[PDB]
Amino acid sequence: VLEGLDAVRKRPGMYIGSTDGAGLHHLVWEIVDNAVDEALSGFGDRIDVTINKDGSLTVQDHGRGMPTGMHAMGIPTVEVIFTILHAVGSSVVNALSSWLEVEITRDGAVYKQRFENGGKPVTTLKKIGTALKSKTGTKVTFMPDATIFSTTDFKYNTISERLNESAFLLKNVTLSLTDKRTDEAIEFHYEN
């Protein structure tokens, strides 16, 4: 049985544990786990996480990029991933975000869709530019909903140690963290 995003908003703790500092960072693990699941599948050798000045957060990998095709009713596949809950991580974050943007680069084209106010699409998946055929990947940027979380301040140390673990488990893949609020940055990379 499928559910909408309002189902996650209704009982947020049931999907991310809680709505405090810990739960806020669960949002980060969800998106990153998808980039890591791409690397593990053999695509992309780096995953860059960026904490922006506006308080939002960005995860960018260099994998194959999420599918750019359509489904039923001319609804993009990426829209199905972010708005239909198969109750899975991508839609949960979108549901608990005041806005979210997904940027896909594949086949020499760059696509983009934006969501707002708990994952309501405000644009479709649009082709907005071109790129080299060698450049591929997915960029997700989201702003955690302040009317749901008790805190929307991402912790540099917390995200830091977790990327260190994920780097250690993956091997051969560099995960980075860049904080544009404080001009700090750090990388993790393990090899065997």
Ligand X SMILES: CCNC(=O)Nc1cc(-c2nc(C(F)(F)F)cs2)c(-c2cc(-c3n[nH]c(=O)o3)cnc2N2[C@@H]3CC[C@H]2CN(C)C3)cn1
* Residues that bind ligand X in the complex, under the rule CB under 6 A: 31, 34-35, 37-38, 41, 59, 61, 63-64, 66-67, 81, 90, 138, 140
Closer residue to ligand X, CB minimum distance, 40 or 150: 40
Residue 184 is a binding residue for its own copies (CB under 8 A): yes
What's at 122, amino acid-wise? Answer: V
Among its own copies, ligand X, none, partner that 35 touches (CB below 5 to 8 angstroms by kind): ligand X
CB-hemisphere CA count at 13 Å for 176? 15
What is the token pair recorded at 147? 């009317």
Number of residues that bind its own copies (CB under 8 A): 13
Residue 68 is a binding residue for its own copies (CB under 8 A): no
Task: State the minimum distance, in angstroms, from the CB of residue 133 to ligand X.
Answer: 14
Scanning 23-31, 35-43, 80-88, 123-131 for contacts with its own copies by CB under 8 A, the matching segment is 123-131
Q: 29: closest CA among 106, 115, 88, 79? A: 88
Residue 186 is a binding residue for its own copies (CB under 8 A): yes
Give the contacts of 72 (CB within 8 A, at least 6 positions apart).
Answer: none
Q: Which residue is nearest to ligand X (CB)?
A: 34
Quick one: CA torsion of 7, 9, 15, 19, rounded to 10 degrees?
-160
At 33, is the secondary structure helix, strand, or coil?
helix
Closer residue to ligand X, CB minimum distance, 39 or 147: 39
Among ligand X, its own copies, none, partner that 129 touches (CB below 5 to 8 angstroms by kind): its own copies
Among 132, 147, 191, 192, the residue binding its own copies under the rule CB under 8 A is: 132
Quick one: CA torsion of 150, 154, 157, 158, rounded to 10 degrees?
60
Among ligand X, its own copies, none, partner that 28 touches (CB below 5 to 8 angstroms by kind): none
Among its own copies, ligand X, none, partner that 66 touches (CB below 5 to 8 angstroms by kind): ligand X
At 71, is the secondary structure helix, strand, or coil?
coil
CB-hemisphere CA count at 13 Å for 27? 35
Give me the residue label for tokens 């544009």.
180
Binding site for its own copies (CB under 8 A): 110, 128-132, 176, 182-187
